[PDB]
Ligand SMILES: O=c1c2ccccc2c(-c2ccc(Br)cc2)nn1CO[C@@H]1C=CO[C@H](CO)[C@@H]1O
């Protein structure tokens with residue numbers, strides 16, 4: 001595991017230094033502030049703002065009501081079909097560790113050691129070169145364990 005950054009200012013946008021081949025792990029440690037409505041981790045094809053970079057995997061915990069996680073893909077500035085997970089491990093004022101495991105056909109995400117969700121690839125993961133973190137969240141570290 002090689003961290004590309006510790007204690008980043010949010011929003012954070014950084015280049016991923018190698019390809020997300022099957023078997024790659026992405027590890028993100030952080031904490032949800034007590035007033036958060038949402039945050040997201042986006043695996044992107046570049047960092048353009050105008051027009052907005054494609055988002056292969058948008059991982060979006062939301063804290064209203066019972067809480068949920070929304071996952072989606074942005075292609076050519078259009079969102080696709082939301083996949084919503086209602087069994088969410090995130091909570092306001094609680095710390096987490098996210099592990100994203102890149103498989104051949106999907107991502108598999110676990111939080112605090114416990115399986116959270118799966119998300120099938122809609123953009124080839126080879127096209128991902130950038131990681132962004134947005135919203136109301138405190139991040140301790142972002143790192144990669146590359147299968148290369
Ligand atoms: O709600 C936000 C948001 C909130 C705080 C900070 C950033 C954002 C951003 C945002 C915009 C550009 C860039 Br670059 C990075 C983040 N988008 N949305 C909007 O998020 C969407 C709203 C509804 O559903 C979509 C998923 O289906 C998505 O969550």
Ligand SMILES: [Cl-]
Nearest residue numbers: 103104105106
């Ligand atoms: Cl697979």
